[PDB]
Structures are given as structure tokens and as C-alpha cells.
Amino acid sequence: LELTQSRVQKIWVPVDHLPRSNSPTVIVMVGLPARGKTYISKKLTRYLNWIGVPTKVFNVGEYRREAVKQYSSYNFFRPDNEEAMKVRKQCALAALRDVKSYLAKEGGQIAVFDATNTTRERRHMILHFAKENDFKAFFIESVCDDPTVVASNIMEVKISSPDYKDCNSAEAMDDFMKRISCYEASYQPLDPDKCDRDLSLIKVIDVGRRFLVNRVQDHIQSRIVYYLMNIHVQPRTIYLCRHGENEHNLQGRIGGDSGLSSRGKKFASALSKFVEEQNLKDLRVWTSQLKSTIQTAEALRLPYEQWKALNEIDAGVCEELTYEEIRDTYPEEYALREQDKYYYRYPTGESYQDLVQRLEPVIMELERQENVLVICHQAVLRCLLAYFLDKSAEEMPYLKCPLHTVLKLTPVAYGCRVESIYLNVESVCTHRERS
Amino acid sequence: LELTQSRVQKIWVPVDHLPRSNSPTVIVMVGLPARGKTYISKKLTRYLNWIGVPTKVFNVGEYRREAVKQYSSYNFFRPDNEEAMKVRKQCALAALRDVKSYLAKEGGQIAVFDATNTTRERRHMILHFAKENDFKAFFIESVCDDPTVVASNIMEVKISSPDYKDCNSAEAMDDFMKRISCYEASYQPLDPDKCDRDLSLIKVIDVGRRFLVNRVQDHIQSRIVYYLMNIHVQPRTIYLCRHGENEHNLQGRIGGDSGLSSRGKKFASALSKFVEEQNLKDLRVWTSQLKSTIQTAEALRLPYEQWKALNEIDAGVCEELTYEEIRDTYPEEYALREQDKYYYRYPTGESYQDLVQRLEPVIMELERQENVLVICHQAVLRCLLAYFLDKSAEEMPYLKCPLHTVLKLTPVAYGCRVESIYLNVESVCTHRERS
Ligand SMILES: N#Cc1c(N)[nH]c2ccc(Oc3ccc(NC(=O)[C@@H](N)CO)cc3)cc12
Numbered sequence: 059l060e061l062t063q064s065r066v067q068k069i070w071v072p073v074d075h076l077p078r079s080n081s082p083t084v085i086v087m088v089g090l091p092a093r094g095k096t097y098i099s100k101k102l103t104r105y106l107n108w109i110g111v112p113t114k115v116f117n118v119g120e121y122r123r124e125a126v127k128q129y130s131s132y133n134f135f136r137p138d139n140e141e142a143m144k145v146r147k148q149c150a151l152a153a154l155r156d157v158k159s160y161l162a163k164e165g166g167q168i169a170v171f172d173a174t175n176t177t178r179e180r181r182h183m184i185l186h187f188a189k190e191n192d193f194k195a196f197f198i199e200s201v202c203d204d205p206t207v208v209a210s211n212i213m214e215v216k217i218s219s220p221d222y223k224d225c226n227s228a229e230a231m232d233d234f235m236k237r238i239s240c241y242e243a244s245y246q247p248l249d250p251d252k253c254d255r256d257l258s259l260i261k262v263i264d265v266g267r268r269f270l271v272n273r274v275q276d277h278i279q280s281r282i283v284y285y286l287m288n289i290h291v292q293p294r295t296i297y298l299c300r301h302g303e304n305e306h307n308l309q310g311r312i313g314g315d316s317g318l319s320s321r322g323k324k325f326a327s328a329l330s331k332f333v334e335e336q337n338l339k340d341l342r343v344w345t346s347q348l349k350s351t352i353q354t355a356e357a358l359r360l361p362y363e364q365w366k367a368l369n370e371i372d373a374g375v376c377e378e379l380t381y382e383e384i385r386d387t388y389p390e391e392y393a394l395r396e397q398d399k400y401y402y403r404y405p406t407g408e409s410y411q412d413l414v415q416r417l418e419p420v421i422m423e424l425e426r427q428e429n430v431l432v433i434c435h436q437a438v439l440r441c442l443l444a445y446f447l448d449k450s451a452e453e454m455p456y457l458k459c460p461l462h463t464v465l466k467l468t469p470v471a472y473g474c475r476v477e478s479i480y481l482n483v484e485s486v487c488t489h490r491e492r493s
Numbered sequence: 494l495e496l497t498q499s500r501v502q503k504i505w506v507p508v509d510h511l512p513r514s515n516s517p518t519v520i521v522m523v524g525l526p527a528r529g530k531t532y533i534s535k536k537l538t539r540y541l542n543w544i545g546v547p548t549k550v551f552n553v554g555e556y557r558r559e560a561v562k563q564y565s566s567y568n569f570f571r572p573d574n575e576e577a578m579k580v581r582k583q584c585a586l587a588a589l590r591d592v593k594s595y596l597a598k599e600g601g602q603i604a605v606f607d608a609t610n611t612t613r614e615r616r617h618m619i620l621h622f623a624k625e626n627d628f629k630a631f632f633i634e635s636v637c638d639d640p641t642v643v644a645s646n647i648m649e650v651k652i653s654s655p656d657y658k659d660c661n662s663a664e665a666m667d668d669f670m671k672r673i674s675c676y677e678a679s680y681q682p683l684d685p686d687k688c689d690r691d692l693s694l695i696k697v698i699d700v701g702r703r704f705l706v707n708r709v710q711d712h713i714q715s716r717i718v719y720y721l722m723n724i725h726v727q728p729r730t731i732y733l734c735r736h737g738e739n740e741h742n743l744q745g746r747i748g749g750d751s752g753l754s755s756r757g758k759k760f761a762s763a764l765s766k767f768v769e770e771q772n773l774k775d776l777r778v779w780t781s782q783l784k785s786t787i788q789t790a791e792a793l794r795l796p797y798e799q800w801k802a803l804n805e806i807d808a809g810v811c812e813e814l815t816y817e818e819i820r821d822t823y824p825e826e827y828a829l830r831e832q833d834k835y836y837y838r839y840p841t842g843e844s845y846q847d848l849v850q851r852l853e854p855v856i857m858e859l860e861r862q863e864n865v866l867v868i869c870h871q872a873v874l875r876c877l878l879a880y881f882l883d884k885s886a887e888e889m890p891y892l893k894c895p896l897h898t899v900l901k902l903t904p905v906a907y908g909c910r911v912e913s914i915y916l917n918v919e920s921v922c923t924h925r926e927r928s
Pocket residue numbers: 092093094095097098200201202207208211262264265266267286287288289290291709
């Protein structure tokens with residue numbers, strides 16, 4: 059029963075010494091415009107790619123934009139606009155043509171089809187396409203009738219679109235409103251107790267006040283629903299930073315549970331003055347279970363919670379060594395690390411990928427919350443930051459996270475403002491270039 | 494900014510050298526009888542206590558049973574039974590009297606109030622009680638009209654109740670049916686678009702085919718909903734066992750990633766013959782990422798998946814040592830371990846509690862699935878087994894999990910049949926008595 063440990067990830071596999079060599083889902087958005095279909099779409103895609111499921115959004119609009127000169131006006135969308143309708147349907151099918159090949163030919167696991175899909179006919183077209191390609195179909199319908207909520211959307215993300223460039227806000231608003239009503243007359247909402255008894259679907263009502271959920275067929279559907287109950291749209295601020303410089307940092311040594319240096323403590327102190335002058339009605343503070351992050355918290359005189367998930371990557375046998383010592387003592391290891399930094403796992407330790415598993419609950423609580431300061435470690439920080447700035451696995455292990463700097467993230471429109479704030483206290487540079 | 498590492502759990506805390514010294518929720522069940530309110534109740538309570546939230550079920554029936562001679566008949570439940578109604582309400586309030594003191598005075602975090610609570614009046618009584626004690630209120634309503642489903646319930650769990658002892662099945666069925674109809678006339682289901690717009694609630698429809706979810710106020714509510722989308726009632730079998738004996742077991746050494754012994758391999762082989770003769774239409778196999786469990790899988794010639802969550806408890810600095818060597822080299826540690834085995838964490842390693850965090854995703858997939866063989870390790874196995882047999886944290890680190898034995902668990906009525914099956918291959922006994 060012979061077996062052999064892979065070199066990068068360190069998984070055992072069977073020696074098989076002419077070497078010969080879960081269906082995908084289409085998440086189908088449904089709803090009138092200005093209902094946050096693209097926002098829910100981007101945000102799910104960011105989640106799924108980050109918990110490792112490959113996912114791509116296929117927004118029918120962008121196809122229309124690649125297809126058609128420059129935005130005339132809402133007249134384009136009139137149901138009597140015979141030729142627009144032809145061109146719009148054509149865009150719809152090109153989107154599907156590309157969905158088929160993302161999922162049947164490039165192994166993506168989920169495609170989000172971001173289109174109004176407000177008519178039972180169109181939804182039968184998609185369902186059919188799903189069947190003949192052995193794709194699952196999941197519908198997320200966002201349904202809301204509050205003019206406040208729509209006006210809001212139209213202001214935050216529509217007027218500032220590409221289609222409007224040549225336009226003052228005033229007119230781009232009236233044009234969109236009229237454009238919404240082009241869908242109003244034929245909109246048939248999803249109905250579980252009628253024409254849609256057999257559809258796997260979630261209906262989001264009034265921006266998450268309420269949900270109708272039908273026929274959850276697999277984990278990934280179940281996890282979408284869980285995600286959707288945890289997100290919200292209240293405005294807020296996520297602050298991320300590392301522990302102030304620690305003894306090991308000063309010796310240039312990795313891992314361990316060392317405590318703050320002198321400069322460490324000064325930064326703790328600077329951070330307190332920093333939070334105060336942010337003037338935040340409320341704020342949660344999180345740390346790891348390591349001394350560094352906890353001492354830094356103590357400086358703030360605010361209450362905090364430790365998360366084992368936040369502990370720095372485990373360097374395994376290499377714990378407490380310096381990078382040079384690692385090159386001298388284990389050359390095979392260092393090389394492999396350098397050519398695959400995301401998947402490389404230390405002997406008896408961890409990999410960035412391992413973090414992302416570990417840190418999923420942290421991501422899920424951050425979505426739940428409002429203002430949060432997360433005091434963690436360099437690799438941990440890189441992960442979180444990847445989630446939030448939609449960075450890839452390829453670039454994650456190289457995102458820059460200097461000591462004594464604070465990262466201030468503000469969810470906004472379609473993503474995140476990110477300001478940097480250096481608190482003016484010297485430290486060692488624990489980076490090493492994208493090698 | 495001085496700090497000190499606790500001895501058991503090894504958490505840093507602040508030296509504070511006259512030492513001076515999230516509201517709770519009431520989950521309110523709602524529905525007609527034979528709707529699985531007690532089943533959902535037990536099962537949630539098992540989950541929550543196991544992810545560490547203290548939780549207790551307060552079923553109004555059992556109070557009625559402590560209050561009233563012996564079960565006459567359904568006449569007890571007639572709405573015109575003036576005196577029963579008085580006594581039943583009294584039971585209801587004693588249940589609440591005990592809920593108040595579990596949550597305000599014994600720090601439980603959740604009480605499940607398992608009663609019909611089918612009338613808006615009664616639900617106002619409870620809501621009121623919640624307000625004046627600053628308890629949250631969450632309603633889980635199970636709603637189903639299929640006679641198959643009710644008959645089923647009545648057969649699996651009602652006729653075999655205490656109340657019926659003096660009775661053949663035939664009559665206990667008619668008596669319960671008549672008893673259901675005592676509630677039918679006054680039943681007002683929860684309605685989010687009417688009298689219950691403002692209630693945090695989940696409505697389970699047709700045994701999970703469909704769900705209505707309103708006003709999820711916190712993580713624990715969000716997590717209940719997630720749990721409820723993952724459970725099911727299809728019958729199936731969970732098989733648990735450890736890897737066959739490994740080299741370290743033979744040296745009597747803990748941790749490491751050693752491979753199977755001779756006897757190890759024989760047991761792998763015996764396990765294959767064991768699965769075959771179980772004759773299971775389908776079966777998932779899971780292992781850890783350690784060689785032992787993986788080699789054992791290889792023997793089965795069935796496809797399997799490795800879970801890092803399943804890896805054995807990390808003994809930290811004590812990895813690869815023998816228990817004697819651990820006593821000789823670290824006496825302070827050994828003692829602490831012996832007096833708090835669940836919370837004790839090895840230096841730079843783990844605690845049983847840590848496992849339970851780690852293993853939560855495994856529990857959640859097991860609920861999703863049907864037949865599953867889980868090949869893991871001694872401590873991992875103890876945890877899983879605690880979840881399934883509703884064992885406490887106090888007894889978990891001492892549950893017996895011999896080598897080369899298979900544990901066959903069958904969900905049933907209100908819990909789990911557990912058979913043992915020893916596959917007749919000698920090994921070393923890696924236990925050590927409840928000390
Ligand atoms: N209509 C509309 C929306 C809009 N203009 N922007 C949106 C952004 C998101 C969205 O869908 C949501 C999905 C889930 C939630 N989740 C929650 O509210 C949870 N806190 C409820 O459990 C909220 C909104 C809906 C909208």
C-alpha cells in the first residue's frame with residue numbers, strides 16, 4: 059500500500075508508477091433594474107473565488123456595450139423597439155455562448171448570469187440551456203418597491219456609469235427611471251407556489267429584510283444563502299493592521315510568539331490616538347491569540363476579542379528561523395516556496411491556501427459587523443486584503459503590508475476605497491520583493 | 494504593557510495585580526403536533542451545545558407529565574376542557590419560570606421553548622416575557638399538511654411515547670389524530686406580511702422543501718438557518734473509525750505522520766470486506782491528510798477525499814514523544830492536562846476545544862450527506878462521536894475508541910442507534926483510563 063508525499067503542498071498520494079489521462083451551476087439573477095443584481099453578483103463572485111470556487115460574472119449589459127455605438131437613451135429599451143430587442147436577445151445568447159465555454163471548456167464551477175431575466179419566457183430559455191449542458195440552475199431574485207431604495211441605487215451607481223458620460227445627473231436620473239418602466243409591464247416575479255414550484259431559488263425582499271427560499275439542492279447553494287443572510291449595506295469602516303514591531307521582527311526571524319519591541323509599544327500608543335481621532339460611535343477590536351497583537355490591543359483601552367483564526371501562518375519546522383537560516387538548512391524547501399508561494403506548505407505547517415480556509419469565519423463575521431479594527435499578522439493580513447480588494451491567489455502572497463501602517467477600507471459603490479495611514483514610528487521592513 | 498500566558502489554555506492575559514468582580518435568545522417553536530418541533534428542537538440543541546453555546550430544551554409536555562396523574566386520552570386537550578386548560582397554561586408558565594432562571598441566573602445563552610404556541614395570544618404572552626427580561630425571541634414554525642408525513646411521525650415517535658404504554662398501536666394512532674384536531678381550529682400560522690411583520694422567524698415548509706425567513710438579527714440566528722438548510726431526514730448510515738495501527742502506535746508515541754503497521758494493513762483489508770458486505774448503493778469516504786488514514790482508504794478501492802480538519806490533535810512540542818517521556822520532560826504540563834483534558838492545550842499545539850472549532854465544517858457536511866465512512870484519529874473521533882451521541886465536554890476526552898473497530902451510527906427516532914463492529918485484527922490499546 060505504498061504512498062508518496064508531494065513536494066509543494068505535502069499531500070500524500072499513491073505511487074501509480076502510457077500514463078493515461080458536482081456539475082457547474084448557473085446563478086441566474088432576476089429583477090427590475092436598480093435592484094442591486096450586479097452588486098449581489100460582484101459580491102458573491104468575490105466570495106466564491108476566494109473560498110476557492112472559480113466564478114465569473116456575465117453581465118448582459120457589457121455585451122450590449124461591446125455591440126452598440128454609444129448610449130442613445132432609454133428608447134433603446136422600449137419593448138416596441140423591434141431592432142433593439144433583436145440585438146439585446148443576441149447579446150443575451152452571446153453571454154450564454156461564453157457561459158457554456160467557461161463552464162464546459164475552461165472548468166469554472168459557477169457562472170453568474172447578470173441580466174434582468176424578468177419574463178418567464180426568458181427563464182425557460184435559460185433553464186433549457188442549463189438542461190442540455192448538464193448545468194444546475196439557481197435563481198437569485200431581488201425584489202423591492204421602495205422609491206427611496208431605487209433612487210439611492212440610481213444615484214450611487216447608474217448616473218456615474220459609462221452610458222451617461224455626456225450628461226448631467228438631473229437627466230440621467232429621469233432617463234433611468236423611464237428605463238426601469240420599460241420592464242415593469244412584462245415583469246413576472248418568481249413564484250414558488252405556482253409556475254416555479256420546482257426551481258432552486260432565493261428571493262431577496264426589501265434589501266434583506268426578508269427571504270423566500272426554495273429547493274436548496276447542494277452545499278454551495280446552502281452557502282450562498284448563508285452569505286446572503288450575513289451581508290448588509292449599512293455604511294462602515296474596516297481597519298486592518300499588524301501588531302507593532304516585535305522582538306523576532308528585530309532579529310529578522312519568522313513565527314514565534316515574541317512580544318513588542320520599544321517601537322512596537324510606541325506604535326500601539328500611536329494607534330490609540332489614531333482610533334480616538336477617527337471618532338467612531340462604536341468599534342469592535344479583534345486580535346490573534348499571540349502576544350504581539352494582544353499587547354497592541356491593550357494600548358487602546360477598548361474591549362477586544364482574540365481569534366485563533368487570526369494567528370500568523372504556521373512555518374512548521376521553520377518556526378523561529380531566519381530566512382537565511384532557512385536557505386542554508388533547507389534549500390529544496392526555499393526554492394519550492396519561491397516558485398509556488400500560495401500553495402507551498404511548510405513541513406508540519408501551513409500554506410496561504412490553508413489560511414484562506416481558516417479565515418473564512420473571520421470574513422463571514424466582518425460582513426455581519428459595522429466598524430472593526432483587525433490587528434493581525436503579515437500573511438493573515440494579505441489574505442484578508444485579497445478578499446476585500448478582489449486580489450488573486452497569484453498576487454496574494456506578495457501584497458505589501460508594512461509594519462506600523464493602518465489600512466482603512468470603505469465599502470462603496472462597486473467595491474472599496476482603501477486609504478493607507480502610516481502612524482510615524484520607525485520599524486524594520488519585513489517585506490521581500492515579488493520574486 | 495505587561496502580559497502573562499495562562500497555564501491550561503495558554504491564552505495571554507493582562508497582569509491586573511480587593512480584587513473586585515449578546516442577550517440570550519428564546520427560540521420559540523410553533524406548530525400543530527406531529528410536525529417535528531421536538532426533533533428540530535433536540536437537533537438544534539445538540540448542535541449549539543456542541544459549537545459551545547449553552548442550550549436547554551424546555552418542552553411543555555414534560556411539565557404536564559410531571560403535573561398530571563397518568564395519560565387519560567385526547568379529551569385532556571379539548572379546548573372546552575376548562576380545567577385541563579388551566580393546568581396546561583400553568584405548565585406553560587412553569588416552563589417559562591424555569592427559562593427565566595436558566596438564562597438570567599445560570600447563564601445559558603439559548604432556551605428552546607418546545608410547545609405548540611399556535612395561537613397569536615400565547616405568542617404575545619411569550620413575546621412580553623421576553624421583553625421584560627431583555628431576551629431576544631426567535632420563532633421556528635414547522636408547517637406541513639401531508640397525511641403521509643404526519644402518520645409517519647405519529648408512528649415513529651408518538652405511539653411509542655410514555656403516555657401510551659397501556660395501549661396497542663391501533664388506538665394510540667386514532668387518539669393522537671383526534672388530539673391534533675384539538676389545535677386545528679385556533680391555529681394561526683405565523684405571517685410576516687400581517688400580524689408578524691416584525692418577528693424574527695423562520696418558517697419551515699413541507700419538511701424543508703421551502704423556507705420563509707424574516708428579520709435575522711444576529712449570527713446565531715443566521716447560523717440556525719444555515720444548519721436548517723443543511724439537515725435532512727432521509728435515512729442513512731454514518732460509519733466512523735480510525736486508521737489501522739501505525740508505527741508510532743507500536744512505539745506508543747503520539748502524533749507524527751507514521752504509516753501503517755502490518756496489522757494496520759490487515760485491518761485496511763478487513764475494512765474493505767466490511768464495506769462490501771454492508772452492501773450500500775452509494776458511500777462517501779473521508780480521511781485526514783495524514784498517511785495512516787489515506788493508506789487505509791486506498792485498501793477500499795473506492796474514491797475518497799482528504800480533510801485537513803480531520804488531522805489528529807496537534808501535540809505541539811510534545812509531538813512524537815511517548816506519554817512517559819512527556820511525564821519525565823514536562824511534569825507541570827502532564828498534570829494540567831490530566832485535571833483539564835478538554836481545555837488543556839499543548840504548548841504550540843491544540844486542545845479538544847480547538848478540534849471542535851475545526852471539525853464544525855465536517856459536522857455540517859455530514860448532516861448534508863447520506864452514507865459516509867469517516868477514517869480519522871482517536872481525538873478527532875471522540876469529538877465527532879460526542880456530537881452524535883450528545884456527550885458533554887467533560888466526558889469527550891475519555892470516550893473509548895479502540896483501534897481496528899468500526900462505529901456504525903444510525904439516526905433514528907430521537908437520536909442514534911450505535912453498533913460496534915470489531916474487525917478481528919490485533920492492535921495495541923492506545924487508551925488510558927478516565928483518570
Ligand atoms: N433592491 C435593492 C438593492 C439595492 N438597491 N442595493 C442592494 C444591495 C443588496 C441587495 O440584496 C441584499 C441581499 C442580502 C442582504 N442581507 C441582509 O440584509 C441581511 N443582514 C439580512 O439577513 C441585504 C441586501 C439588494 C439591494
